Amino acid sequence: FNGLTGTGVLTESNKKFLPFQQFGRDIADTTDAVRDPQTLEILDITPCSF
């Protein structure tokens, strides 16, 4: 998404995203959630269980 490659399980996210917001980022700078470029649907980012 937006030139960033990450591996994680993809699920819809309950948290609302404002129109300006395209991504949700943790303090650690890891991207918790992203909004799809093709369609504006909020998706939670969950890393595959380890």
Partner: protein, 197 residues
């Protein structure tokens, strides 16, 4: 316990210190460490692998230094926790398991017994203690001469209300008429200092 969380505050503080160390590692990932971007992926996407590695090397040195500092803090905290655990084990062995003659080892006053209470990452000891409630002043004699022979109490010390002489234990006031069985006879009155008749 219900009114104040301060008593469990020290246990909470230890949990907070562990959480702070994890939070510090999260903050470190945000730090650039001299790299163009803090995120490893951002450097990899915009730079060739050989070029990206040099920026990674700078992030790795900072991250390794952060991990070493975090491990050192955890080891020092573990050593402090181990010392507290050793003290707790000593308290359980010499208070909960058996009465302690050590002074103030388990609470102010004379410890009788202790009760263990489960706590998160902690142990709580409740110790029953003996504390004087009411105290009175009585005239006292080191020794008493029945026939010019010094008498020293086998148990307790001489006390006098102001009319009669009694022998009672130091811990609690239980006046008893002085008897030859109660007080052993040793030495003579002249040798003893402050002796009364």
């Amino acid at each position: 316990l219900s009114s104040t969380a301060s008593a469990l505050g020290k246990l909470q503080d230890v949990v907070n210190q562990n959480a702070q160390a994890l939070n510090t590692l999260v903050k470190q990932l945000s730090s650039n460490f001299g790299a163009i971007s803090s995120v490893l992926n951002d450097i990899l996407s915009r730079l060739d692998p050989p070029e990206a590695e040099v920026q990674i090397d700078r992030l790795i040195t900072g991250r390794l230094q952060s991990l070493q500092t975090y491990v050192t803090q955890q080891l020092i905290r573990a050593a402090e926790i181990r010392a507290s655990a050793n003290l707790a084990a000593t308290k359980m062995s010499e208070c909960v398991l058996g009465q302690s003659k050590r002074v103030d080892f388990c609470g102010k006053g004379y410890h009788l017994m202790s009760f263990p209470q489960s706590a998160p990452h902690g142990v709580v000891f409740l110790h029953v203690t003996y504390v004087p409630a009411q105290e009175k002043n009585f005239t006292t004699a080191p020794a008493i001469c029945h026939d010019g022979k010094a008498h020293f109490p086998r148990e307790g010390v001489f006390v006098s209300n102001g009319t009669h002489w009694f022998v009672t234990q130091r811990n609690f006031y239980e006046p008893q008429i002085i008897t030859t069985d109660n007080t052993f006879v040793s030495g003579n009155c002249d040798v003893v200092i402050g002796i009364v008749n």
